Each structure stands twice: as structure tokens, then as C-alpha cells.
Design a protein around this ligand. Structure first.
Ligand SMILES: [Cl-]
Ligand SMILES: [Cl-]
Ligand SMILES: [Cl-]
Ligand SMILES: [Cl-]
Ligand SMILES: [Cl-]
Ligand SMILES: [Cl-]
Ligand SMILES: [Cl-]
Ligand SMILES: [Cl-]
Ligand SMILES: [Cl-]
Ligand SMILES: [Cl-]
Ligand SMILES: [Cl-]
Ligand SMILES: [Cl-]
Ligand SMILES: [Cl-]
Ligand SMILES: [Cl-]
Ligand SMILES: [Cl-]
Ligand SMILES: [Cl-]
Ligand SMILES: [Cl-]
Ligand SMILES: [Cl-]
Ligand SMILES: [Cl-]
Ligand SMILES: [Cl-]
Ligand SMILES: [Cl-]
Ligand SMILES: [Cl-]
Ligand SMILES: [Cl-]
Ligand SMILES: [Cl-]
Ligand SMILES: [Cl-]
Ligand SMILES: [Cl-]
Ligand SMILES: [Cl-]
Ligand SMILES: [Cl-]
Ligand SMILES: [Cl-]
Ligand SMILES: [Cl-]
Ligand SMILES: [Cl-]
Ligand SMILES: [Cl-]
Ligand SMILES: [Cl-]
Ligand SMILES: [Cl-]
Ligand SMILES: [Cl-]
Ligand SMILES: [Cl-]
Ligand SMILES: [Cl-]
Ligand SMILES: [Cl-]
Ligand SMILES: [Cl-]
Ligand SMILES: [Cl-]
Ligand SMILES: [Cl-]
Ligand SMILES: [Cl-]
Ligand SMILES: [Cl-]
Ligand SMILES: [Cl-]
Ligand SMILES: [Cl-]
Ligand SMILES: [Cl-]
Ligand SMILES: [Cl-]
Ligand SMILES: [Mg+2]
Ligand SMILES: [Mg+2]
Ligand SMILES: [Mg+2]
Ligand SMILES: [Mg+2]
Ligand SMILES: [Mg+2]
Ligand SMILES: [Mg+2]
Ligand SMILES: [Mg+2]
Ligand SMILES: [Mg+2]
Ligand SMILES: [Mg+2]
Ligand SMILES: [Mg+2]
Ligand SMILES: [Mg+2]
Ligand SMILES: [Mg+2]
Ligand SMILES: [Mg+2]
Ligand SMILES: [Mg+2]
Ligand SMILES: [Mg+2]
Ligand SMILES: [Mg+2]
Ligand SMILES: [Mg+2]
Ligand SMILES: [Mg+2]
Ligand SMILES: [Mg+2]
Ligand SMILES: [Mg+2]
Ligand SMILES: [Mg+2]
Ligand SMILES: [Mg+2]
Ligand SMILES: [Mg+2]
Ligand SMILES: [Mg+2]
Ligand SMILES: [Mg+2]
Ligand SMILES: [Mg+2]
Ligand SMILES: [Mg+2]
Ligand SMILES: [Mg+2]
Ligand SMILES: [Mg+2]
Ligand SMILES: [Mg+2]
Ligand SMILES: [Mg+2]
Ligand SMILES: [Mg+2]
Ligand SMILES: [Mg+2]
Ligand SMILES: [Mg+2]
Ligand SMILES: [Mg+2]
Ligand SMILES: [Mg+2]
Ligand SMILES: [Mg+2]
Ligand SMILES: [Mg+2]
Lengths: 174, 174, 174, 174
């Protein structure tokens, strides 16, 4: 038993490792989207940079779980990071829809981890999730949903001018 | 009788209270428009912020009438603030058209109050309306009319790209 | 169903709308207190400004619930804002006692909403209430209780000098 | 006829001269109050300075009428400035009550002049009164009324401690 360990259930330790893998998986999926929008036959630079930043943020989420695991006296166990579901992402609308579903999948895993932490009476883990993870998900899900609404308004997928304008006006100029 | 009261007719005092209610009503209607444009399935952020600011300005108009009432020795009497006429506002064009009519309704009430103040020979109240209320209405009515003309030019309600562009270029970036 | 909606119960959505109305109601009651203390026959300016600020804070509480509703994919539904219980507020002690009870009524509604969020296993809503609402209530209830104790010490309601001194020394100079 | 004169009725010219005298009369009354509160057996320095400033403001009101008269092509005609109604002013409450009535007397004369200007269809004179005189009166009447309410709250005339505190906290520290 780690000398620091107190009120930290083995199930929660394991679930934190699984969550860590999912954060890394999400990072890798976003990195794939970045590379896609940087292709010369796609060429939406601000969209590409948006997904690059999304990828970097997921890696930070992963690293925070590693640090958490050690703070509680659990042990980080890594597994393969599975490649993303697609090799090409269609267009800005398809990619944003996939991002929305990814962020909701991550959110559900975090909510499930909160359920487990609650069941095991671990208020520190509950607070960690609430203070560091759950609001980030709600905020980003809202942001991405708002983007999707605007992409549809702009006539995606068919309206190329709409897609061009989204890249200029909706995402950060990079 | 209030010790400060001089040349302030009971009818004007009552009409000031009714005008106060109308300012609050207008504020609440604009707040509803703000919340509508902030919906994830509407997602026009600059338009939402435009209406939020419109709402804040109406509250300031209301507070100025409260202060006026007390300065003249009248007594503030509040009534319920009725909820807005609609729960959803359609799109930027429908909302702007409703805003135009709201500002004209407020303007007519102010003009009617000026008629009353004139009839009761209250030059202080006339000056207050002319110097603090009537030009604000003319200016904002012109601004909103100009917006409506541009929304029609941009192909509202059908042209989603037009609506997107209005939010980027016509209203303040927020 | 809103594309952003996840783990957000219809009951919680409805309760958030009811809470929004209560925040607006509280704002309006405080605005009435402001106008009362600004009367020439009351004339306690720092007390008036205290209640004006209380009113502005309640409006901010309301707006934060509107934003929350949309972030979760719920839909803002507004109802009439009922006028305050009184048209005149007696004196600083009576008004502060009414403020204490108002803040406790708001607190109870927030605690009830937390119970509901807990029952529906909504940790995001629980965190939102705990991080943005519940401590504000405890702090302001303590502040107002402290004021009431001092108003009683100063001989309210009978001691006019005491009431004058409270306005100079207890509330912020405005 | 003055070369500049246009739309300026002889009656208005005369009434402006009478108003000028009243402004000077008001100044002199306030100067008497200043000297009274500066007496060693009265010794309320901030109250004295309040009335000194009131006196200076009335002189500015008078000078503005002189300038106005000449701008319109009328001719300034001066009369004796009558001494104030009292040689001693009792206490802060009696003086403030006399100030309230003085400011209301001045206000009534200004309102009467506005009636005359209206009757003679002189919009420039109407605007001058509304923009330079009428709101000053409403504001100062409210200020003085508020003071009287506080003096009564403080137990004037009998409560010497109340009167002392008013001088320290209600009027500007000078
Ligand atoms: Cl261990
Ligand atoms: Cl343990
Ligand atoms: Cl334990
Ligand atoms: Cl265990
Ligand atoms: Cl594991
Ligand atoms: Cl596998
Ligand atoms: Cl693929
Ligand atoms: Cl997914
Ligand atoms: Cl968070
Ligand atoms: Cl967006
Ligand atoms: Cl641009
Ligand atoms: Cl956008
Ligand atoms: Cl009255
Ligand atoms: Cl009157
Ligand atoms: Cl009159
Ligand atoms: Cl009347
Ligand atoms: Cl009324
Ligand atoms: Cl009704
Ligand atoms: Cl509707
Ligand atoms: Cl209307
Ligand atoms: Cl104006
Ligand atoms: Cl425009
Ligand atoms: Cl425009
Ligand atoms: Cl929904
Ligand atoms: Cl849901
Ligand atoms: Cl869930
Ligand atoms: Cl539900
Ligand atoms: Cl509802
Ligand atoms: Cl009802
Ligand atoms: Cl009442
Ligand atoms: Cl209550
Ligand atoms: Cl809080
Ligand atoms: Cl206190
Ligand atoms: Cl003191
Ligand atoms: Cl002090
Ligand atoms: Cl205190
Ligand atoms: Cl002449
Ligand atoms: Cl002439
Ligand atoms: Cl003419
Ligand atoms: Cl003439
Ligand atoms: Cl003359
Ligand atoms: Cl004589
Ligand atoms: Cl005398
Ligand atoms: Cl007089
Ligand atoms: Cl003025
Ligand atoms: Cl005062
Ligand atoms: Cl005072
Ligand atoms: Mg060891
Ligand atoms: Mg284990
Ligand atoms: Mg970011
Ligand atoms: Mg993200
Ligand atoms: Mg993540
Ligand atoms: Mg494989
Ligand atoms: Mg908890
Ligand atoms: Mg937080
Ligand atoms: Mg964060
Ligand atoms: Mg946004
Ligand atoms: Mg009275
Ligand atoms: Mg009446
Ligand atoms: Mg504005
Ligand atoms: Mg407006
Ligand atoms: Mg208004
Ligand atoms: Mg109704
Ligand atoms: Mg004017
Ligand atoms: Mg103007
Ligand atoms: Mg203005
Ligand atoms: Mg313009
Ligand atoms: Mg949908
Ligand atoms: Mg429902
Ligand atoms: Mg505050
Ligand atoms: Mg409060
Ligand atoms: Mg509140
Ligand atoms: Mg009712
Ligand atoms: Mg906190
Ligand atoms: Mg706060
Ligand atoms: Mg304290
Ligand atoms: Mg000549
Ligand atoms: Mg003549
Ligand atoms: Mg002054
Ligand atoms: Mg004065
Ligand atoms: Mg004067
Ligand atoms: Mg004589
Ligand atoms: Mg003015
Ligand atoms: Mg002035
Ligand atoms: Mg004041």
C-alpha cells in the first residue's frame, strides 16, 4: 500500500487509468483532424489550428489525471492509444459533428467516474471531477454545438463559400 | 403632501409610474431576445449581446424614472412586470422587427406623457422627457430600422449566410 | 432534443426556470427598497444605494441562470415578475429584516434545487449551485444579520439618531 | 430698438430684471445664514460654509440673467436688494426650512417666467429656463428636503448632539 493512500478505492484507481487512456485517445483524434484540415486539398487553416489546440488540451487533461493518480497513491497504468475512427474527416461540418460526439463520449465517461467516486464515498475525487473536468465539457460541448448550428446556417456541406467564411469568422484567426 | 412637491400633478405622477413599468417591460422583452440568440440552435452571439445591452439600457431608463419621481415628491408605485409576448423570437429579422415596434411603443408612451406634462403646464417634466428620453428613442428607432433594411438586403429570413454575416459585421463584436 | 443536452433532467430544467423567476423577483423587491430610501421623507442615501446594489446583484444571478440553461440545452421560459410584497418599507430595520427573509427564501429555493439535482444525479448542476450560489447566500445572510443586530443596538425603530448613524457608518459611503 | 433684438417681448425683458433681483435677494439671504452659523455662539462651520456656497451660486444665477438680458438686446435695470427677513436664523433646522421655502419661491418665479415666455412664444427663453434654471431648483429642493428629514430624525431642534452630527456628516466637510 502506498504511504499516502487514504480513502482511494482500487476501482477508482483503475477507472482513472481508463479515463487517462480516453483523454489520450481524444487528443489523438483531434490531432488527426488538425492534419486533415492542413492538407493542400482541404486548406482551412483556422479550422486546422482549432483542432490542434483541442488536441493539446486533451493531452493536458491526460497529464492532470496522471498527476492525480500519483497524488492519491494510485499507480499509472498505460495502454495502447487507439488510432482515430477515420483517416479523413470529410469537411468542417463532419469534423465538428465528430468532435461534438467525442466530447459527449468523454463527458459520459467523466460522469460515470463521478458515479463511481460517489458510490465509493470519495469526495476528493468528486470535487476533482467537478472542479477540473465537468464544466470544461459543458462549455466545449456548447461551443461546438454553436459551431454546428452556424455551419448548417452557412449551407454546409454543399456551400463552399459558407465553409470558407466559417474558417475566417467563427474560429480564432491563427 | 411631500415637502419638495411643486407644480407636479397627480396625473403626471401616475403616468410616470406607468411609464416606469413599460421601461421594465421593455427590458424584460429584450432579455428574452438575448436568451433566445444564446440558444445552441440559434447561436448568434453578437446579436444576443446586442439585445442584452438593449435590456440593460431599458433598466437604466426605468431607474431614471424612479429617481425623477422622488425628486419631484411623487411616490414610486410598482406593478407586475408582464412576461414578453413571445417565448421564441424566430430569427434576427423577426426579433429586430419586434424591437422596432417595442421602441415605437415606448416612444408613443413618452410622447403621450409629454402631451400630459404640457397640458398640466409642467416644463420640468417636458424638459426631462426631451433631454433624457425622446432623442434616445429617435436614435435607436433609426438604428433598428437601418438594421432591418440590411437584414432584408441580406435575404432574411431564408438566407442563412446573410444572417451569419449580419451578426459578424452589423452588430458590435462582443 | 438539443444537440448539447446530456444528463439534464426535464425537472431540473423547469426548476432552473422557476429559480430564474425568483432571482428576478428578488431583484425587483430590492429595487423597491432602493426607491423607498431615496424618498425625500426617508432620505437615507447609503441605505438606498445598498439596496440598489443588492438589486443589481440579483439580476446578475438571474442572467447566470439564463446562460446556464442554454449551456445545458434547456430552454429559458419566462413568467411575470410579481411586484414586491410592500409598497413602502417602514425604516432601515424593517427593510433589513425583509431582506434577511428574502435571502433565506432564495437560499431555501437553491437548496431545494440542489436536492433535485442530487436526486437526478446531476453533478454539474450541483457544482454550479455550490460554486456560484450557495456561499453567496451564506455570506449575504451573515452580512444582513450582522446589520440587524447593529440596528437593534442603535435603538431602531425609535432612535432616529441611531438610524442616521447606521447609514453613515455601517453601509458603504456612496 | 437694439440691433440684436428679435422675438423678445418687453414683458419678458421686465420679468427677467425682476428675476435678477430675486436671485440677488436669495444670495443675500444665504449670506446672512452663513454669517449666523459662523457666530461663536452658533459655531457650525460646515453648515456656515454650505450657506456661503448657496449664496455664491445665487450670485452666479443673477449674473447669468444679466448676460442673458444683454444677449437678447434687453436692458438690465437694477433695484435695491432687500435685506433678509430675519437677522438670526435659530438653528440648522429653522435655517434649512427657510432655505427650502426660498428655493421654492425662486422656483415659482422661474415657472411663472416660463409661463410668460410661453405666452409670448419665446422658445429661446423657455429653453434657457429649462436648461439653466429649472432642474437646478428641483435638485436643490430635493437636497434641502432630504436634509430637513435628517435634521428631524436627529431630534432637532432640541437634540444638540443631533445638530452637531449633522454638521459633521450631512454637509460637506469644509
Ligand atoms: Cl496502494
Ligand atoms: Cl485507501
Ligand atoms: Cl473515509
Ligand atoms: Cl480498494
Ligand atoms: Cl488499470
Ligand atoms: Cl483491442
Ligand atoms: Cl476514413
Ligand atoms: Cl465518440
Ligand atoms: Cl471544469
Ligand atoms: Cl459559433
Ligand atoms: Cl472582416
Ligand atoms: Cl460562429
Ligand atoms: Cl405629495
Ligand atoms: Cl404640486
Ligand atoms: Cl406653476
Ligand atoms: Cl394634483
Ligand atoms: Cl400609480
Ligand atoms: Cl393583467
Ligand atoms: Cl412564442
Ligand atoms: Cl410593442
Ligand atoms: Cl434623449
Ligand atoms: Cl445597419
Ligand atoms: Cl449594417
Ligand atoms: Cl432538449
Ligand atoms: Cl438529457
Ligand atoms: Cl449520466
Ligand atoms: Cl428528462
Ligand atoms: Cl418551465
Ligand atoms: Cl399568479
Ligand atoms: Cl405597503
Ligand atoms: Cl421572503
Ligand atoms: Cl457562491
Ligand atoms: Cl454590521
Ligand atoms: Cl460619529
Ligand atoms: Cl467619521
Ligand atoms: Cl455595522
Ligand atoms: Cl430694444
Ligand atoms: Cl423683439
Ligand atoms: Cl417670431
Ligand atoms: Cl414688446
Ligand atoms: Cl425692469
Ligand atoms: Cl419697497
Ligand atoms: Cl430676526
Ligand atoms: Cl421665501
Ligand atoms: Cl437647470
Ligand atoms: Cl440628507
Ligand atoms: Cl444626510
Ligand atoms: Mg512503502
Ligand atoms: Mg487495484
Ligand atoms: Mg482552447
Ligand atoms: Mg475540447
Ligand atoms: Mg478531455
Ligand atoms: Mg486497430
Ligand atoms: Mg458533491
Ligand atoms: Mg468550476
Ligand atoms: Mg480547464
Ligand atoms: Mg460562445
Ligand atoms: Mg412632511
Ligand atoms: Mg395621485
Ligand atoms: Mg447601447
Ligand atoms: Mg434601445
Ligand atoms: Mg426605454
Ligand atoms: Mg399573463
Ligand atoms: Mg430643452
Ligand atoms: Mg438632447
Ligand atoms: Mg441616453
Ligand atoms: Mg448608424
Ligand atoms: Mg437539432
Ligand atoms: Mg421539460
Ligand atoms: Mg455587493
Ligand atoms: Mg444579496
Ligand atoms: Mg440571488
Ligand atoms: Mg398581484
Ligand atoms: Mg466557492
Ligand atoms: Mg458571486
Ligand atoms: Mg462583516
Ligand atoms: Mg442702434
Ligand atoms: Mg420694455
Ligand atoms: Mg453647490
Ligand atoms: Mg441653492
Ligand atoms: Mg437662484
Ligand atoms: Mg426694509
Ligand atoms: Mg438639463
Ligand atoms: Mg447649474
Ligand atoms: Mg442626495
Amino acid at each position: 500500500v502506498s504511504q499516502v493512500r487514504q480513502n482511494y478505492h482500487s476501482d477508482c484507481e483503475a477507472a482513472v487509468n481508463r479515463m487517462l487512456n480516453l483523454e489520450l485517445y481524444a487528443s489523438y483524434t483531434y490531432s488527426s483532424m488538425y492534419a486533415f484540415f492542413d492538407r493542400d486539398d482541404v486548406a482551412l487553416h483556422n479550422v486546422a489550428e482549432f483542432f490542434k489546440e483541442q488536441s493539446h488540451e486533451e493531452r493536458e487533461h491526460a497529464e492532470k489525471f496522471m498527476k492525480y493518480q500519483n497524488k492519491r497513491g494510485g499507480r499509472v497504468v498505460l495502454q495502447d492509444i487507439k488510432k482515430p475512427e477515420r483517416d479523413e474527416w470529410g469537411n468542417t461540418l463532419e469534423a465538428m459533428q465528430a468532435a461534438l460526439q467525442l466530447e459527449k463520449t468523454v463527458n459520459q465517461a467523466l460522469l460515470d467516474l463521478h458515479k463511481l467516486a460517489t458510490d465509493k464515498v470519495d469526495p476528493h475525487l468528486c470535487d476533482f471531477l467537478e472542479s477540473e473536468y465537468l464544466e470544461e465539457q459543458v462549455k466545449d460541448i456548447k461551443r461546438i454545438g454553436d459551431f454546428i448550428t452556424n455551419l448548417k446556417r452557412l449551407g454546409l456541406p454543399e456551400n463552399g463559400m459558407g465553409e470558407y467564411l466559417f474558417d475566417k469568422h467563427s474560429v480564432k484567426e491563427s
